[PDB]
């Protein structure tokens, strides 16, 4: 769900290329640990977020590895 969060949209956009995954393999729902997200690119994506201001730290991606919650830990903490 992408609204102000839309900037994640543009992690994601890179982050299909980034591991060069499929669509059918990259949603939302879909797990980054599972697709193989390397760690370095997982500390790459947390200046990403920073970025703009959004919150979250890297140990909840870990925690729950799939798109949705990255993205999501950035609504969850103010709806945007």
Same mark, same amino acid.
């Given at each position: 769900?992408?609204?102000?969060?839309?900037? *994640?949209?543009?992690?994601?956009?890179?982050?299909?290329?980034?591991?060069?995954?499929? #669509?059918?393999?990259?949603?939302?729902?879909?797990?980054?640990?599972?697709? +193989?997200?390397?760690?370095?690119?997982?500390? /790459?994506?947390?200046?990403?977020?920073?970025?703009? +201001? *959004? /919150?979250?730290?890297?140990?909840?991606? *870990?925690?729950? #590895?799939?798109?949705?919650?990255?993205?999501?830990?950035?609504?969850?903490?103010? #709806?945007?």
């Amino acid at each position: 769900d992408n609204r102000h969060a839309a900037d *994640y949209q543009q992690l994601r956009e890179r982050l299909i290329q980034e591991l060069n995954l499929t #669509p059918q393999q990259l949603h939302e729902e879909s797990n980054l640990i599972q697709a +193989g997200l390397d760690s370095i690119r997982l500390m /790459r994506w947390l200046h990403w977020f920073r970025k703009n +201001g *959004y /919150r979250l730290t890297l140990r909840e991606l *870990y925690a729950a #590895p799939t798109l949705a919650a990255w993205n999501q830990l950035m609504l969850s903490r103010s #709806p945007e």
